[PDB]
Amino acid sequence: GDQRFGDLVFRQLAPNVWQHTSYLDMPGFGAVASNGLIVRDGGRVLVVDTAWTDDQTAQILNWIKQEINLPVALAVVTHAHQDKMGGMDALHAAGIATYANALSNQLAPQEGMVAAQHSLTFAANGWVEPATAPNFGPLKVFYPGPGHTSDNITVGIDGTDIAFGGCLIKDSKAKSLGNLGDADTEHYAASARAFGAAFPKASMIVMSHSAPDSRAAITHTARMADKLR
């Protein structure tokens, strides 16, 4: 099922949704997979997260050209770490409009990232302010609160059973919450549960560092974060 395309992997999740996977060596972790999404919305394509590097991100765009052959209207990136924003320059070189949490754009320079062109802001309840996410189509963007990072955001795909937790959510058999160096241990558990409650009918939970899982990924991630506070 999985399509190897250069050094990346692509997996169809639904008629209009694919997971992109790219890898980077991290001493002490091995070659770490990071997952994002590609969504076809009618005559255009929407991307969630870059790959780790510009070169890998250009390869995502090459795959889109070969397998979908429609323009990429925008990309939204889910926090200011390299696995999610490392390929911003490749998107900009391709003329793609890019979006991130305002706080991700604020943090990007100190994190070694290039900021997105546009900043999303969020209501007190976590839902994106709609005027900051124009033309997002089926992408429903939700800020669950600080957790994996202060800026992490999540995305549901209307018309599917899919919600993307990014690096906030780990799989239902995961053993650790991963990189906690920028995390908010006090609010993580609540933020994970807020993601689940924002997308209550999503039965396929996509995440950055594990293959797609059931909603038990949310309950398990929350149950592990419950131990952090």
Cite the annotated binding site for Zn(2+) by residue number: 79, 81, 83, 148, 167, 209
Q: Which residues are annotated as a binding site?
A: 79, 81, 83, 148, 167, 170, 179, 209
Q: Write the interaction track for Zn ion spanning residues 54-93; mark x where CB under 5 A is met and - where it is not.
A: ---------------------------x-x----------
Binding to ligand EFF (CB under 6 A) within 127-156 occurs at: none
Please check whether residue 193 is in contact with residue 218, taking contact to mean a CB–CB distance below 8 angstroms. Answer: yes
Query: Per CB under 6 A, does 172 bind ligand EFF?
Result: no
Residue closer to Zn ion, measured from CB, 138 or 217: 217
Alpha-carbon distance of 150 to 172, in angstroms, equals 23
Query: Per CB under 6 A, does 167 bind ligand EFF?
Result: yes
Nearest to 155 by CA among 147, 143, 167, 146: 143
Cα dihedral 144, 147, 150, 152 in deg (nearest 10) = -50
Phi and psi dihedrals of 31, rounded to 5? -85, 105
Q: Write the interaction track for ligand EFF spanning residues 62-101; mark x where CB under 6 A is met and - where it is not.
A: -------------------xxx------------------
Smallest separation, CB 181 to ligand EFF (Å): 7
Q: Which of 25, 29, 211, 229 binds ligand EFF (CB under 6 A)?
A: 29
Q: Count of residues for the chain? A: 229
Please check whether residue 165 is in contact with residue 148, taking contact to mean a CB–CB distance below 8 angstroms. Answer: no
Number of residues that bind Zn ion (CB under 5 A): 4
Alpha-carbon distance of 91 to 112, in angstroms, equals 16
Alpha-carbon distance of 53 to 112, in angstroms, equals 12
Query: Per CB under 5 A, does 104 bind Zn ion?
Result: no
Binding site for ligand EFF (CB under 6 A): 29, 32, 81-83, 167, 178-179, 209
